[PDB]
Amino acid sequence: EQVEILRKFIQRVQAMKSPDHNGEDNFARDFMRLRRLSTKYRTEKIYPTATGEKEENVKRNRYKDILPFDHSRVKLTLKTPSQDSDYINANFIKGVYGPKAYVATQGPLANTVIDFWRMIWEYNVVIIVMACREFEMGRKKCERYWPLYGEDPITFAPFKISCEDEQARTDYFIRTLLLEFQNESRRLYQFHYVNWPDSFDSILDMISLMRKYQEHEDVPICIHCSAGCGRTGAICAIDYTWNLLKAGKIPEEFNVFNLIQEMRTQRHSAVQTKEQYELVHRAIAQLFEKQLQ
Amino acid sequence: MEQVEILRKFIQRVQAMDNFARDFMRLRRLSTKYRTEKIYPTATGEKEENVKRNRYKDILPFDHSRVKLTLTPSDSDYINANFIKGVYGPKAYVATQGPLANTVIDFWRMIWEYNVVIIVMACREFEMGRKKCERYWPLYGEDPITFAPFKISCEDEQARTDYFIRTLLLEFQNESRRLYQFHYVNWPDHFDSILDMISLMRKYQEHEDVPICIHCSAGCGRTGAICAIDYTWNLLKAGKIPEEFNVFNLIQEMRTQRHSAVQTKEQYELVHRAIAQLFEKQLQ
Amino acid sequence: EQVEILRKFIQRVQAMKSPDHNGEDNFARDFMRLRRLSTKYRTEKIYPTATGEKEENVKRNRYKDILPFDHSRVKLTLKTPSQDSDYINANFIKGVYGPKAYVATQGPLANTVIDFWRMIWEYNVVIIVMACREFEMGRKKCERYWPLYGEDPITFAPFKISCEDEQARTDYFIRTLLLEFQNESRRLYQFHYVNWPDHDSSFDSILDMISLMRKYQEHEDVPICIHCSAGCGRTGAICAIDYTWNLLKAGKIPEEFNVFNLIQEMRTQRHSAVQTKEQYELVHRAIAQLFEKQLQ
Amino acid sequence: MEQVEILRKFIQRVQAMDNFARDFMRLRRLSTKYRTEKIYPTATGEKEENVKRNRYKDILPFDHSRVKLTLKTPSQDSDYINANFIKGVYGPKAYVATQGPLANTVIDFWRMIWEYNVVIIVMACREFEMGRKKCERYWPLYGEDPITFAPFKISCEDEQARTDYFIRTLLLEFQNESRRLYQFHYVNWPDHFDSILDMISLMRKYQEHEDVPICIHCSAGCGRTGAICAIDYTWNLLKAGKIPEEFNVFNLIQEMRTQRHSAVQTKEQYELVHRAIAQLFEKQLQ
C-alpha cells in the first residue's frame, strides 16, 4: 500500500546521503552512472542531434553543448514573415498521463524570442515556468521576453505581449500575460522562480500553485532555465511525481533514478548536476513525508 | 486514386466543358437559394452607419466570415471584407473591396492588425471612365502619403509582364513594416501572367500563417478567381488534389465565405483553364 | 542615564499604539500635526519652492506635488554639454554632526538621469540607497540608471557607469558600481531595498541594510544619497532611523530625545520627508527595536 | 579693490610699454632656469618609444601635467600623446593644449577627444604654411565622404565663414555612440585682434564652462595656442569679476609655462596677448 511505499522511499533517500569508503554518497554515484548512460546513448547514435548542429542552427543555440534530440524536438510549423525555420532548441517530455506534458527549452536569445512565441502560440501553451534570472554570476542567462508589470506592451511582430498583473510570493513571481497574434489573444501565466538553492518549500509551493492554474495535461506546460536542463529537469521530475502522488498512484517499483534517466533521453542533460539529482530526491521525500500525515 | 491520375482526368473534362455558362447559372441559382432561407446573414453590413463604408449596396460581407477591426482616434469594427480558408489556415486570404476615401483608414487598420505582408490588387484606380478604387499608395518617388495615424511610403517598383510590384512601408507608433503590393493592371474581363504573378507572389510568402489581402473593386470576382487558383495551386504542390476534385464545388464552398466570390461566367471559365494549365504543366 | 532614556522611549512607543476614544492612536494624531505644521510653513512662505516650479523645471519633477525647498535644494554647479541647468529635485538633510549628511532625491526620470549623475559626481557621493523598485503597483516609479550585473556598461555622456559586482541579502541587493567621467573613476555602492513593508520587530532587513551600509561608510564627510520614487516617505523613514542609530552608536541619545521633533525638522529640509502615518509608526518601532537590542 | 580701477592701471601700463621684448627675455631666461635645474621633467616624452609621436624633438610635455590616454584601441596601446592640461579659472582641465597631430597620431588625437568628452576644438594654423606641412588634416572637408580612423570615424556636417576663421560642425562615432563637435579654424594668425576676440567669444557661446576641456592646438601646441588660452582665461576672469589687484601678463604666462612647455613662444605673441587683453579691458569700461 502507498504508506509502505512512501516510507520505503524516505528511508532509501535518508540512506543515500551516507558517503562511500571513497567519500562519495549515492547521489554522487548514481549521477556518474547517469552521465555514463548518456555517453552510451550518444556513441551508439541512439539519440542524434543532427538538426541542432546544422550550420544554420548554430546561431539559434545558447550553448554549443546543449542540443535538442531529433526524436523529441519541438517542430515549429507556424511561420512568420521574418522566421519560417522549424527549428527551436526545445524538446517534449512525457508526463504521468502520456506524451507532451512538458516542453523544456533554453532561455531565448535576442534572435529567438520570436521562435519562443511561435512555439507558445502553436502549441497552445498557457503555463510558463522560468527558473533562471535574466542575469546570474555576472553572465547573461536569458533574454527578457516578457514586459515588466507596468511596462508598455512589447512587440515581436507578429506577436504582441502585455503584462497585466504581477504577484509576489516568497521566491517567485507570477506574471499574468496577454499574448496577441492577428486579432486573437491568449492569457498566460509565467511563474518566475528567482531564488535557486544549487528546505524546498518555495519550489513545492510554486509547483502546486501552478497546478491550480492548469490542473490538466492537455496542453504542455513550458519550462525553461538558461540552458533548459538542470533546474528545468528538477522541476519536471518533482511535478511529475507530485502528479503521480496526488493521483494516489505511486507505483510499487517507483524509482527516481529511472524517471530522470528516461527524462534524460527526451531532453539532453535533463537533470544536469548531482546537486540537482539530490534536490529532486529530497523534495520528493518531503512531499511523501507530508502526505504521511 | 493517385495525384497523376486525378490530374489528367481534370484536364480531360476541362477540354470538353456553353456548359460553363450553364454550370455557372447552376451556381448562381444555388447562391440565390442561399439568399432566401438566409443560411448566411449580412446583418452588420447593412446597418445604417455601414452603408457609407460599402462600395456597392448589393455586396455585403457574410456575418460569419467577416473581418473585424479593433486596432483609432475616431472606431468601428466594420470593413467590407471576409476571410477565405486556404489549405490549412482559416485566415489564408482576406478578400475585400477597393477602399473608399473614408475607409482607406479601416483598410490599414486591417493590414496592420492582421500582420499582412502581401497585397494583391487586380483592378485599376480608374476603369471605363469610372473610379474603382481609392489609390491608397504613394507613386514610385512621390513623398510619403499619410493617413493618420498611418504613414505609408513607396520604396520601389518593378514591371513584370501585366503587373507591378511595389515595396511599401507602413508606420504607426514608431513601428514599421515592409509590404509588397502586386498590382495586376490588365484582367481579361470578356493566364500565364496571372499564373506568373501568383507563383512570384508565393516566392514572397509560401505560407498561410498571415493573411494575404486580395481585392479588386467589389472584392469578389477577379478576387475570387485568384484565390481559387492560388488555393488549387497550393493543393497541387502539396500533392493533395482530392479524387473527385471539381471547380464547381470549389467555387460554391468559396461562395459561402465571400459573397458572390466568383462573379462572371467568364471568370468561372478562366478558373477552369488556368487550373487545367497548372495540372497539365505538372505532368511535365 | 542612557538605560533610563532608552527604556522610556520603548514604553512610550508601546503606549502610542493604543487607539483613543475616536479610534486614532498617537501615530495617527502626531501625523496629523506634522501635516498641519507643513501647511503652516507653506502658507507663511517660510519655505518657498520657487525654483522647482518655474515653467522650465516642470519637466524635471516626477510628481507635481513634490518640490524641493529652495533653501536646502541641491544645486548642480557641474555642467555638461547636454545639461547646464543647476536644478535637480533634491535636498540636503542635516545629520548628527551637521549639514549634508544626506541627499534626498526623487527617482530620476529619463531626462534627469544625467542630472542624477552630475550630482553624484559633484558631491563626491559613494553610497546610494534606493528604496523603490523600477515599477510598483503597475506604475513606473524610477528610471533604471544602473547597469544590471553582467550587463554592458551604460553611457549617459559624459558619464559612463559599470556594474562590477552584485550581492544578494534578504530584502535588498548591494551593487558595486564604477562611475567614470572624463578619464576619472569612482567606486559607488548601491543598496537597493526591494521589499518595503509599510510596517512589521520586524524591520530586521531594513536595520541590516543600514548598519551594513554604515560599514561601507562610517563617516559623514560626504553625503549619502537616498532616494525612492518621490524622494520622501521611505527616504525620510530611512534617514530618521540611520540618524538615530548613529546617535545611539555614539552613545549620545539626548535626554530630550523626541522623534516627532527629528522628523518635523527633517520635513523642513525635504518636503514630506516621512510621508504617511504608517511610515511614521515604522520609524518609531524600528528605533524601539534598536533600543531594546542595545538593552540586550 | 574695485575691478573698474584694477582694469584701469592695466590699460595704462600696456599703453605705456621694446619693453615687451625685454619682459619676454626675462620669461625665456626664467624658463631656461626652470630646466637645469630640472624642476619639471618630461621623462615620458623623451623615451625612445614616443620619439615618433612628437612633431618637434624640442617641444616635450611636462610629465606632471600631460594628458594620459587610456582608451585602449584595436590596438594602439600607449597612454602617450603630446599634450598638456592647462588650468582654467576653476577647472584643472579647462584646456588641453596639444601639437597638431602627425599622420600616425591622428588616432590618439581622437582617442583624446573621446575619452575626455571634448566638444570644442580650436585650430590656429593651416595644414600647410610657408611651404611646410604644419598639421595633419584630421577632419573631412565640407561635402567629402566621412573619413575614418579605426576604431574611430568622423564626418562633417556644416561649415560657416566668420571673418578670419571657420566653424566646422562634425560628428564622430565610436562603437555607434556618437558626438557632435565644433572645430574653430583660425586661418590667419598675424605674427607679425578683433577676429581673435571675436572667435573666442563665439566659442564661449557654444561652451561657457570649464567642465569639459576645450582642445586648442596650433602646430607645436604652444605659441598661438598659449596666447589664445591666456586671452580666454583672462576674459573669463574679466566676466566673473575676478581680475586680481596685482594682475599681470608676465606672471600669467609664467604660470602657464609651468603647465605646457614654452606656452607663449614669441615676443610678438607676448605683445599680442597684452594688447588683446587691454582692448578687452577698455571695452568693459564701456
Curated annotation (Swiss-Prot), chain A:
State how changing residue 198 to A affects the protein, per the record: Abolishes enzyme activity
What are the boundaries of the signal sequence?
none
Localization recorded for this chain is: Cytoplasm; Cell junction, Focal adhesion; Cell projection, Podosome
For the ligand (substrate), the binding residues are: 35, 62-66, 198, 225-231, 272
Q: What is the effect of changing residue 35 to A?
A: Decreases enzyme activity
Q: Where is the active site?
A: 225
Q: How is it modified after translation?
A: Phosphorylated by STK24/MST3 and this results in inhibition of its activity.
- Protein origin, superkingdom: Eukaryota
Q: Which residues carry this modification: Phosphoserine?
A: 18
Q: Where is the Tyrosine-protein phosphatase domain?
A: 27-287
**Quaternary structure annotation from Swiss-Prot or TrEMBL:** Interacts with TGFB1I1. Interacts with PSTPIP1. Interacts with PTK2B/PYK2. Interacts with LPXN. Interacts with SORBS2; this interaction greatly enhances WASF1 dephosphorylation and might mediate partial translocation to focal adhesion sites.
Similarity annotation: Belongs to the protein-tyrosine phosphatase family. Non-receptor class 4 subfamily.
Tell me the function of this protein: Dephosphorylates a range of proteins, and thereby regulates cellular signaling cascades. Dephosphorylates cellular tyrosine kinases, such as ERBB2 and PTK2B/PYK2, and thereby regulates signaling via ERBB2 and PTK2B/PYK2. Selectively dephosphorylates ERBB2 phosphorylated at 'Tyr-1112', 'Tyr-1196', and/or 'Tyr-1248'.
What is this protein's record name?
A: Tyrosine-protein phosphatase non-receptor type 12
Which organism does this record belong to?
Answer: Homo sapiens (Human)
Highest classification ranks of the organism: Eukaryota, Metazoa, Chordata, Craniata, Vertebrata
Curated annotation (Swiss-Prot), chain B:
Mutagenesis or variant effect for residue 55 to A: Decreases enzyme activity
Which residues take part in binding substrate? 28, 55-59, 189, 216-222, 263
The record gives the effect of mutating residue 189 to A as: Abolishes enzyme activity
Quote the annotated effect of residue 56 to A.
Abolishes enzyme activity
Active-site feature positions: 216
Residues that bear N-acetylmethionine: 1
Q: Which domain of life is it from?
A: Eukaryota
Question: What does altering residue 255 to A do?
Answer: Decreases enzyme activity
Every copy of the Tyrosine-protein phosphatase domain together lies at 20-278
User: Where, subcellularly, is it found?
Assistant: Cytoplasm; Cell junction, Focal adhesion; Cell projection, Podosome
Q: What is the effect of changing residue 190 to A?
A: Decreases enzyme activity
What protein family is recorded?
Belongs to the protein-tyrosine phosphatase family. Non-receptor class 4 subfamily.
User: What does it do?
Assistant: Dephosphorylates a range of proteins, and thereby regulates cellular signaling cascades. Dephosphorylates cellular tyrosine kinases, such as ERBB2 and PTK2B/PYK2, and thereby regulates signaling via ERBB2 and PTK2B/PYK2. Selectively dephosphorylates ERBB2 phosphorylated at 'Tyr-1112', 'Tyr-1196', and/or 'Tyr-1248'.
Q: How does it assemble?
A: Interacts with TGFB1I1. Interacts with PSTPIP1. Interacts with PTK2B/PYK2. Interacts with LPXN. Interacts with SORBS2; this interaction greatly enhances WASF1 dephosphorylation and might mediate partial translocation to focal adhesion sites.
Q: What is this protein called?
A: Tyrosine-protein phosphatase non-receptor type 12
